[model samples]
Target: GSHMAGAQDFVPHTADLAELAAAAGECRGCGLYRDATQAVFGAGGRSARIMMIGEQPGDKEDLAGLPFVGPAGRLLDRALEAADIDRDALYVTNAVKHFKFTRAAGGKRRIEKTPSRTEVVACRPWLIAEMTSVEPDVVVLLGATAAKALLGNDFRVTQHRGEVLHVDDVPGDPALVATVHPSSLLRGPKEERESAFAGLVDDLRVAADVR
Candidate 1:
């Protein structure tokens, strides 16, 4: 754990999406690779105009070696549709490519562990690389983890959710919008879930309009 190198060294020089995806499997960027089944790289068309970033791969995503393919992803699909954002025109990925999880004693279930800030920093190069390749016009950060990964720890998604802001340093200068992760909606009580989902949709609508 003390020997973490971060992902800069592991990231390939090429901007090709396929090359980066393949190289990601061999990354030892921050020791998350050891326990993960495989690296889950970003997916979607290279020409996509919008890019969505999540915190990390979830249980189903880790097993499937894909991003946003699990329950949260399904919820996101619905939110996107509700916001009138075209899913086919979007690129999706995680702030960290590997799945960080812990298994309960005597239980087969793998519960997700929030990646430490060190791991998020370690994995940032890949996110930057993805942005370079996709050149998206709008980048939607789902949850605080994704928000902090790019916007720094000072950013509070609640205060500025659904607002279109611009960042100069990111690869493509994509418009940024921070919002709650879809998984949060899944965790909420039925009474509050509807309003929360609507809120997420509203944030996405902002991104859609900006894009």
Candidate 2:
């Protein structure tokens, strides 16, 4: 049910983002790797000034073996554009590289399952490696899972959403901002969808300003 070494052993001691991504596929840091299609690593240039961290891969990302290529990703793209942040120049990743899910009745559909804290801890070293390699000026933590993963269990995104804060423990000491996940907008009431999306854009604007 667990791996003794975790992702630390699989994380190569190199600043090369390409190499790190390539090596991530072999990570058996936790049981998530066993069911997921493949490891979905961070994407974008090494000199990116902004790093966006999501919870984990969705169904499309798991199949594509890339970060942020699903419906939520499309919403994120729109939010970034609304905030006037260049998507191409930002490095996007997930707190956990592997997808976690459970099969449907006939095993045709994959329903998402939140990764446990133990799994998040198991996969954190990879996130640290990415942070150290990219060294972005700002980090945007999308959703509670991501905020908690980097910030701590006691941190509340609702209490301080869109405010820039400094985290000394992060690799580059990038200014950190927390916001709701794009998926939340999709799940919210239809009438409130517009306002929820606007709020997300507002938060991303804060991150852009700091970056």
Candidate 3:
């Protein structure tokens, strides 16, 4: 399901966000782009101080051509509000620009599939570009995919979530923090939902307090 070598071969090295976005529209980066509806690009305040990165666009995000606009996004907005982080001021995006999914029975619904490592690597340039464009003081990595893209694959979110660390080689080398994706809360066991959501809010507080 993953195609390397030519992944992101179609994407150009454009510094302008709009230009890069336009180029991604026709990206043949990996096979994921073929089944995806369109390239869901990052969107937020151009000069945001905080940047939130997710794994990939969900179904709703794919149709809308925006990141973090689906169910998880709503939860994220709530968590950010509770954490005193201004969602309006954060630049939200994803590690992978395309929505990877498999058709459900009869092909009526699309079920999400995890973006393979190769796919993440393929789409990483966009993430780096967005990071450089926003030049955020703090970068929030949501889920393993997002974390692996910025930090190394060995970084463990479960063991070190809520810990803010510095990143090198990025535009401003923003502080990096990892946390579970908002979607995880929805899928988690009912008994654990409260604590999980609280943890998310707590982790986001670190981002809010970042200088």
Candidate 4:
């Protein structure tokens, strides 16, 4: 099966995106949602020209009931502002709706983990809803996780970074730019982080230019 989520498909109906988002809020289609505090739907900004996507929820994101609001997200915000891309004008989201994490601090703190293919497939419908409604001209895949989740199996940031790929497999007719994750900069050797960030900016600049 090329598409997952047997219960639903990500079809753009040109209707209110909220209806679709709300449905996913109560979704039990995947086991991840059950363990996650809530299904974090992408924040809305239909008029946005760009859509920023992260891999999965983080510690604060899981606790705060939002996506991309944690450390890496803050860095991403700074980088976008530095790039001169309007932070408020871009629609931001994540590939997986749930928080897949390892138990840490005696289960008090959840360590982040990647979602499996089946899990990502299960939640494709919701991501589709986000794309269908937002209808952005371009999308930025924040890391390898997101790139693979949205762009498909063969996506590789090292080989494809800074280039726009047509993602017909996804919901909207948007150009996708896969780049290094902000967290990569956070963890990389201090000296190399600047070059990495500059490369990321290069990718974003390309995305910003897409109509």
The estimated TM-scores of all candidates read 0.94, 0.95, 0.91, 0.89
Off by over 4 Å in 1: 1-5
How well is each residue in 148-173 modelled by candidate 4, as lDDT tens digits? 87878677789888888996677668
Candidate 4 regions exceeding 4 Å error are: 1-14, 105-108
**Candidate ordering by TM-score (highest first):** 2, 1, 3, 4
Ranked by lDDT, the better of candidates 2 and 4 is: 2
- Candidate 4 or 1, higher lDDT: 1
lDDT of each: 0.91, 0.90, 0.85, 0.78
The residue pairs in collision within model 2 are none
> Tens-digit lDDT track for model 1 on 13-71?
98899999999999999889999999999988789988999999989999999998889
How much is 175 displaced in model 2, in angstroms? 0.2
* C-alpha root-mean-square deviation, each candidate: 1.9, 1.9, 2.4, 2.6
Q: Give per-candidate clash totals.
A: 0, 0, 2, 0
After superposing candidate 2 on the true structure, give the runs of residues whose Cα lies further than 4 Å from its correct spot: 1-5
10 residues in a row with least lDDT, candidate 3: 2-11
